[PDB]
Design an enzyme around this catalytic site. Sequence first.
Site, mmCIF file in Angstrom:
data_model
loop_
_atom_site.group_PDB
_atom_site.id
_atom_site.type_symbol
_atom_site.label_atom_id
_atom_site.label_comp_id
_atom_site.label_asym_id
_atom_site.label_seq_id
_atom_site.Cartn_x
_atom_site.Cartn_y
_atom_site.Cartn_z
ATOM 1 C CB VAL A 120 -0.637 -0.240 -4.066
ATOM 2 C CG1 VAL A 120 -1.242 -1.362 -3.230
ATOM 3 C CG2 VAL A 120 0.159 -0.809 -5.231
ATOM 4 C CE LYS A 144 -4.092 2.023 2.231
ATOM 5 N NZ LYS A 144 -3.617 3.419 2.023
ATOM 6 C CG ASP A 201 3.608 -5.137 -31.970
ATOM 7 O OD1 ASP A 201 4.627 -4.539 -31.563
ATOM 8 O OD2 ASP A 201 2.456 -4.741 -31.707
ATOM 9 C CG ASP A 208 1.034 -1.223 -35.208
ATOM 10 O OD1 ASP A 208 0.185 -1.680 -36.002
ATOM 11 O OD2 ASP A 208 1.008 -1.452 -33.982
ATOM 12 C CE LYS A 259 -9.983 -6.985 -5.608
ATOM 13 N NZ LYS A 259 -10.619 -6.051 -4.637
ATOM 14 C CB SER A 296 9.036 -4.308 -26.673
ATOM 15 O OG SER A 296 8.711 -5.046 -27.840
ATOM 16 C CG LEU A 350 4.907 -0.007 -3.509
ATOM 17 C CD1 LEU A 350 5.096 -1.203 -4.433
ATOM 18 C CD2 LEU A 350 6.217 0.744 -3.328
ATOM 19 C CB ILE A 377 -13.332 -8.853 -31.064
ATOM 20 C CG1 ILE A 377 -13.651 -9.452 -32.435
ATOM 21 C CG2 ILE A 377 -14.507 -9.057 -30.117
ATOM 22 C CD1 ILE A 377 -14.024 -10.924 -32.387
ATOM 23 C CB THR A 382 -11.666 -9.055 -25.699
ATOM 24 O OG1 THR A 382 -11.324 -9.901 -24.595
ATOM 25 C CG2 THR A 382 -13.061 -8.498 -25.493
#
Length: 326
Positions: A56, A51, A181, A247, A63, A171, A53, A97, A92
């Site tokens: 958070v 928390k 990609d 892309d 959780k 990346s 951080l 989609i 998805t």
Amino acid sequence: TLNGGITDMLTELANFEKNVSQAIHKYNAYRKAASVIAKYPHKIKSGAEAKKLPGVGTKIAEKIDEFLATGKLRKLEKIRQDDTSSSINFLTRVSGIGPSAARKFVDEGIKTLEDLRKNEDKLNHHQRIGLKYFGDFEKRIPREEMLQMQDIVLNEVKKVDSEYIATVCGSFRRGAESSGDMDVLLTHPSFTSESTKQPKLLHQVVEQLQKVHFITDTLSKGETKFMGVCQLPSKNDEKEYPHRRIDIRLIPKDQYYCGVLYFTGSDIFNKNMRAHALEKGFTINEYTIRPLGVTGVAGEPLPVDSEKDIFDYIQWKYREPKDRSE
DNA sequence: CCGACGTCGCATCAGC
DNA sequence: GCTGATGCGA
DNA sequence: GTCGG
Ligand SMILES: Nc1ccn([C@H]2C[C@H](O)[C@@H](COP(=O)(O)NP(=O)(O)OP(=O)(O)O)O2)c(=O)n1
Ligand SMILES: [Mg+2]
Ligand SMILES: [Mg+2]
Ligand code: NA
Ligand code: NA
């Protein structure tokens, strides 16, 4: 992989809110929290520790306490069991989609890969190609293959016009040993923020790449942005390489540094940097960095002579591409 | 507490 | 057709 | 879901 269990959990929750709940800001919130934990250099012992951080809060900390004690999350366990959520989450995964279309397909009883394949006529063009290469788009691209793809792209671009400059970002530019990609930034001296002295600048390059059978499909195509599919050539008797997403972004040559900063990413890094910019009273896009007048309107573009100049304005110490993988 | 959450390109659709 | 909103994605 | 004001 220090806190991979926690970050995987938060990522799954992010995707749920995005795809099923259609709550884009909860998706961003979970993505932000997952990112800050991923770079935290200690194995997290408790939700209270987490928390501390930024990003958070109380709910996620709770959780994390559940996940640490049990090794799982009841909220997620239920989500995985729900047929509607599971159906939508699968649909998805097809490029094109989204949350809305997926929920609509489910309503019409179209919810499996088999359903999709026998109902191609109800998909738009992007979605149809997404289905076509569903398996291939799941696959990572080894940096070795990225290097081959780079060679082809740069050499074919050079053949069209020597004044073109193509830069592989995403990346790859951050030095990843594998990429999802290929992202290519493109410039030409005839296209600046001041004028466009030549038509079809992006089109010409795309055409050339198609002509040599590198680019194979087109998802979308405008004057400055191409989204499509490409494939490396294979040798005799060799199984074909998987088809890859590519892309290409044409950016005014004088706005290269803002353009390359954007296209290098990462996506969360860009979100974080642009958020920080706002706090410092600036706004950053792929073209410019502009001051924000007290009213709230963006002022005139500021002089930028390097990626570092952009960092300087918002009072951030410069970070090499390899350290922007957030 | 609660407003705002990074920013924009292309495809699609609604309304005129 | 134009304009603006929405969906989806980079 | 989080958080700065
Ligand atoms: N949400 C997003 C998505 C895209 N981007 C612009 C910058 C992202 O780093 C970048 C390239 O998009 P990308 O290919 O989907 N992600 P990235 O290249 O960083 O990693 P991969 O999944 O290709 O390995 O485009 C962005 O700024 N914010
Ligand atoms: Mg990429
Ligand atoms: Mg990409
Ligand atoms: Na916090
Ligand atoms: Na999708």
